């Protein structure tokens, strides 16, 4: 996260870190046994870490659970990042409490102007490299489809929205990928892509979760 603030320990209780010997992606807990992330975050050997603040220090609220199965969206296209969404099932259920909690799926899509919270352990600089140990937070609005498409001509599908600031300076970044965009208590987005980080006229692009609720719910019910 560039230009954000220190969230505070366990103030974002649905936030997960995906670990393959090191943090490599974010995710969201959507029930006791399932996590949602980006498809471009796919790898084999994933451990899910819940209850994290400092990802380098065991502080006492953590749950570390292996993934049993990963499911990349059937129509994921790694060239265009269309359908950039993946489900991860945990080997056993997490224990849910005030500090580890699931986030609700939307019943309807959010519109431009809604304010949202974006969170993660990704890079904090736009020019150069500095990875935080503690979770960072950013309040950002959803942008119009028209400003989104104007920023990235020929690149935005119906499964994508932009959020952020056209003036630059505040954005998600490398290492935030797969993490949550939550708006009015519902998961509306997944951190997906962008050109650089926090560049002017280049906002963040997010997977539009409300398009995938049917797939998520049917997939969970059958697996």
CB of 18 to Ca ion, least distance (A): 14
CB of 60 to Ca ion, least distance (A): 8
Is 26 annotated to bind ligand?
A: no
CB of 51 to Ca ion, least distance (A): 8
Q: Of 63 and 192, which has the nearer Cβ to Ca ion?
A: 63
Is 171 annotated to bind ligand?
A: yes
Footprint (CB under 5 A) of Ca ion, residues 40-79: 52, 54, 59
Q: Of 53 and 84, which has the nearer Cβ to Ca ion?
A: 53
Beta-carbon count within 10 A of 124 CB: 20
Is 62 annotated to bind ligand?
A: yes
Q: Of 23 and 186, which has the nearer Cβ to Ca ion?
A: 23
- The answer to whether residue 145 is catalytic is no
Is 177 annotated to bind ligand?
A: yes
Is 52 annotated to bind ligand?
A: yes
CB of 77 to Ca ion, least distance (A): 35
Q: Of 62 and 145, which has the nearer Cβ to Ca ion?
A: 62
Measure the CA–CA gap between 215 and 150, rounded to whole angstroms. Answer: 30
The count of residues interacting with Ca ion (CB under 5 A) is: 3
**Residues β-bridged to residue 120:** 136
Query: Catalytic residue positions?
Result: 40, 84, 177
Residue positions forming the annotated binding site: 52, 54, 57, 62, 171-172, 174-175, 177
Residues near Ca ion, by CB under 5 A: 52, 54, 59
């Amino acid at each position: 996260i560039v230009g954000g603030y220190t969230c505070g320990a366990n103030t974002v209780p649905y936030q997960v870190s995906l670990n393959s010997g090191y943090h490599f992606c974010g995710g969201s807990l959507i029930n006791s046994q399932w996590v949602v992330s980006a498809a471009h975050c796919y790898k084999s050997g994933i451990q899910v870490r819940l209850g994290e603040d400092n990802i380098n220090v065991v502080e006492g609220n953590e749950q570390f659970i292996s993934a049993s199965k990963s499911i990349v969206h059937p129509s994921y296209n790694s060239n265009t990042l269309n359908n950039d969404i993946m489900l991860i099932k945990l080997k056993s259920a997490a224990s849910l409490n005030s500090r580890v909690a699931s986030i609700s799926l939307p019943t309807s899509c959010a519109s431009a102007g809604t304010q949202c919270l974006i969170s993660g352990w990704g890079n904090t600089k736009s020019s150069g490299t500095s990875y935080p140990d503690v979770l960072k937070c950013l309040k950002a609005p959803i942008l119009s489809d028209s400003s989104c498409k104007s920023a990235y001509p020929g690149q935005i599908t119906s499964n994508m929205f932009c959020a952020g600031y056209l003036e630059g300076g505040k954005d998600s970044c490398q290492g935030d990928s797969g993490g949550p965009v939550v708006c009015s208590g519902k998961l509306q987005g997944i951190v997906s892509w962008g050109s650089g980080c926090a560049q002017k006229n280049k906002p963040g692009v997010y997977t539009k979760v409300c398009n995938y609720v049917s797939w998520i719910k049917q997939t969970i019910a059958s697996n």
